Amino acid sequence: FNYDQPYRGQYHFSPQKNWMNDPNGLLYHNGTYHLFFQYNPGGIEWGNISWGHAISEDLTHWEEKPVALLARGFGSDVTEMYFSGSAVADVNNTSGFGKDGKTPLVAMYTSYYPVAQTLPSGQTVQEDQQSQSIAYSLDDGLTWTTYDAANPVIPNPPSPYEAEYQNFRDPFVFWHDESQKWVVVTSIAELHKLAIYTSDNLKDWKLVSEFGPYNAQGGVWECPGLVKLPLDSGNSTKWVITSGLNPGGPPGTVGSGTQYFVGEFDGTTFTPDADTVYPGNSTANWMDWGPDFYAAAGYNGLSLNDHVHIGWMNNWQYGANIPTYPWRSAMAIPRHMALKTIGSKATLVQQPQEAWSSISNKRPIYSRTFKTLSEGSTNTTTTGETFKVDLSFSAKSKASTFAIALRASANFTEQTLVGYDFAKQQIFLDRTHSGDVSFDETFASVYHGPLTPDSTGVVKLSIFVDRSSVEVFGGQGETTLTAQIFPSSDAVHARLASTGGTTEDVRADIYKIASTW
Numbered sequence: 001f002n003y004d005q006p007y008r009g010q011y012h013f014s015p016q017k018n019w020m021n022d023p024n025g026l027l028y029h030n031g032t033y034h035l036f037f038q039y040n041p042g043g044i045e046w047g048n049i050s051w052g053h054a055i056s057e058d059l060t061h062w063e064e065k066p067v068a069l070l071a072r073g074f075g076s077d078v079t080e081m082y083f084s085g086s087a088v089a090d091v092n093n094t095s096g097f098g099k100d101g102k103t104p105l106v107a108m109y110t111s112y113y114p115v116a117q118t119l120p121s122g123q124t125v126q127e128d129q130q131s132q133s134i135a136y137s138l139d140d141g142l143t144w145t146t147y148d149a150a151n152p153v154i155p156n157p158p159s160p161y162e163a164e165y166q167n168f169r170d171p172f173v174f175w176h177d178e179s180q181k182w183v184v185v186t187s188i189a190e191l192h193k194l195a196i197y198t199s200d201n202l203k204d205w206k207l208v209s210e211f212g213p214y215n216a217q218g219g220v221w222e223c224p225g226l227v228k229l230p231l232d233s234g235n236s237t238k239w240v241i242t243s244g245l246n247p248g249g250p251p252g253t254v255g256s257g258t259q260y261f262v263g264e265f266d267g268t269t270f271t272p273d274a275d276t277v278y279p280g281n282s283t284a285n286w287m288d289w290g291p292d293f294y295a296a297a298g299y300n301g302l303s304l305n306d307h308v309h310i311g312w313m314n315n316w317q318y319g320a321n322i323p324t325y326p327w328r329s330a331m332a333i334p335r336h337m338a339l340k341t342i343g344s345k346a347t348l349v350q351q352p353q354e355a356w357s358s359i360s361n362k363r364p365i366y367s368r369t370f371k372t373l374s375e376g377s378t379n380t381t382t383t384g385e386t387f388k389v390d391l392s393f394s395a396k397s398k399a400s401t402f403a404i405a406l407r408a409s410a411n412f413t414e415q416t417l418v419g420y421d422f423a424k425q426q427i428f429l430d431r432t433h434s435g436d437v438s439f440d441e442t443f444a445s446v447y448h449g450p451l452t453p454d455s456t457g458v459v460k461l462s463i464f465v466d467r468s469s470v471e472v473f474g475g476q477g478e479t480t481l482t483a484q485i486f487p488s489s490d491a492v493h494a495r496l497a498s499t500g501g502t503t504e505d506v507r508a509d510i511y512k513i514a515s516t517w
């Protein structure tokens with residue numbers, strides 16, 4: 001398939017055609033990274049919801065596979081859609097679904113029932129009911145058999161929340177080594193609360209705890225996850241819950257986004273650290289401070305120092321109307337997950353996880369240093385649409401802002417600014433003039449995230465630009481900002497801007513990135 005379209009991310013996953021949302025079923029198994037996803041095999045907006053499937057060996061060069069779980073009744077009257085979920089390798093065959101070949105892979109997902117019906121299990125469901133169901137694969141994920149004899153395996157929200165039957169979703173299941181149990185985290189989405197269950201077999205589930213609400217609650221809670229991450233460089237760890245909400249995303253945005261909490265988990269209960277939860281209902285720990293980082297989910301099958309989350313690189317505010325064809329939506333750059341102590345606080349740090357050396361020029365197309373960069377804007381360089389920028393500079397500069405203007409037309413009336421506000425100690429990303437912003441009024445915005453200089457006073461930014469996106473990794477990765485842009489074909493220029501004064505100790509390098517398709 002030829003993926004050479006305007007706006008087609010060349011180093012982000014998207015399906016060849018049709019609509020995609022949340023990442024699903026993330027599992028590394030026998031050398032392979034599986035990427036499932038919410039998919040419409042019949043259209044370019046949300047509908048007919050199914051699990052698509054793609055694989056890579058390197059989180060970079062993806063190959064699209066056949067549809068894994070195709071909406072039941074697709075092409076006729078649809079009776080069941082496969083909402084979001086997760087996947088594990090049941091290597092010891094606790095489910096019993098293994099035969100005389102491979103052990104089973106097992107998927108746990110939300111069944112959405114668009115019509116009232118009685119299921120093969122003999123259970124009755126109501127119109128718009130959401131329940132938790134399982135399927136299995138004996139061919140390493142290529143094809144899947146749904147567990148029709150008993151699905152759904154978690155039909156109802158826990159009491160006293162039975163009324164929440166339409167909004168009960170997004171199971172993240174994983175093997176908890178310490179308790180030798182399967183654990184699943186689900187979202188009672190309207191209540192801003194998660195429900196945690198255990199199992200010895202993936203079929204029979206017992207409710208063990210509920211978590212939340214805390215922090216951000218200005219939207220329905222979705223896409224919960226729980227993972228053990230390393231802290232700093234020794235042997236300390238902490239558990240982290242990641243969860244989405246829609247709307248009520250990060251300050252400065254309108255729509256969806258992703259928050260987290262740091263704590264401990266004992267196999268049944270997640271206890272948030274005292275400093276991860278904030279009085280009230282507004283302040284939160286944002287995984288990403290930009291508008292287009294949602295439904296972020298973790299990989300099963302990875303070790304402590306190898307953990308990866310993938311996010312949907314879109315926003316429900318306007319996601320249906322991005323000017324893409326014949327696909328809609330991409331995933332963000334996969335995000336390596338760790339914790340670092342920053343300003344005396346265990347803080348999520350992310351790294352851009354692709355095989356960059358396989359696709360990046362070694363020689364920068366642009367590279368400069370300035371002991372003092374003068375106020376104003378430098379000479380223009382041409383970057384193409386796909387590249388990485390490395391910037392560093394002194395926090396003590398007199399400029400009000402320092403930034404790169406990129407994906408810019410030659411006269412820079414079209415541009416996306418990525419920089420730092422010295423007084424506010426914030427990263428900004430201004431896409432107000434970034435190109436096509438016509439399809440939603442909230443799209444043409446300036447976004448912000450906090451970033452304290454390092455110990456030596458240096459602010460560092462790494463910026464990844466692909467055909468319709470910008471991703472900013474600040475400092476060691478403690479602040480990311482992810483933003484779609486839709487620039488015109490000529491918007492391939494860049495320059496540096498020191499506004500209101502000079503910027504000291506500037507270092508700037510830009511490297512070209514090749515296609516992974």
Ligand SMILES: *[C@@H]1O[C@H](CO)[C@@H](O[C@H]2O[C@H](CO)[C@@H](O)[C@H](O)[C@H]2NC(C)=O)[C@H](O)[C@H]1NC(C)=O
Nearest residue numbers: 040041042043044045046047048049074075076
């Ligand atoms: C769900 O999938 C169906 C196809 O099974 C889509 O179907 C109809 O609408 C399309 C318009 O783009 C046509 O291309 C299809 O031929 C037509 N066919 C059928 C079976 O109805 C439908 O639009 C999809 N739903 C959404 C919301 O995209």
Ligand SMILES: *[C@@H]1O[C@H](CO)[C@@H](O)[C@H](O)[C@H]1NC(C)=O
Nearest residue numbers: 089090091092175176177180
């Ligand atoms: C598989 O069994 C072994 C031995 O009991 C154990 O180490 C492991 O935790 C089991 N479960 C999984 C999912 O690996």
Ligand SMILES: *[C@@H]1O[C@H](CO)[C@@H](O)[C@H](O)[C@H]1NC(C)=O
Nearest residue numbers: 377378379380381382494495
């Ligand atoms: C800008 O760079 C171009 C290309 O190298 C060069 O021709 C031009 O002289 C530069 N302008 C200035 C003022 O240096």
Ligand SMILES: *[C@@H]1O[C@H](CO)[C@@H](O)[C@H](O)[C@H]1NC(C)=O
Nearest residue numbers: 409410411412413414488490
């Ligand atoms: C900027 O360049 C574009 C052509 O790409 C043009 O449409 C526009 O008029 C120019 N703007 C100004 C202010 O010169």
Ligand SMILES: OC[C@H]1O[C@](O)(CO)[C@@H](O)[C@@H]1O
Nearest residue numbers: 022038083084170222223295
């Ligand atoms: O596609 C439906 C799925 O999408 C999400 O709403 C979030 O983007 C999930 O909560 C749900 O499972």
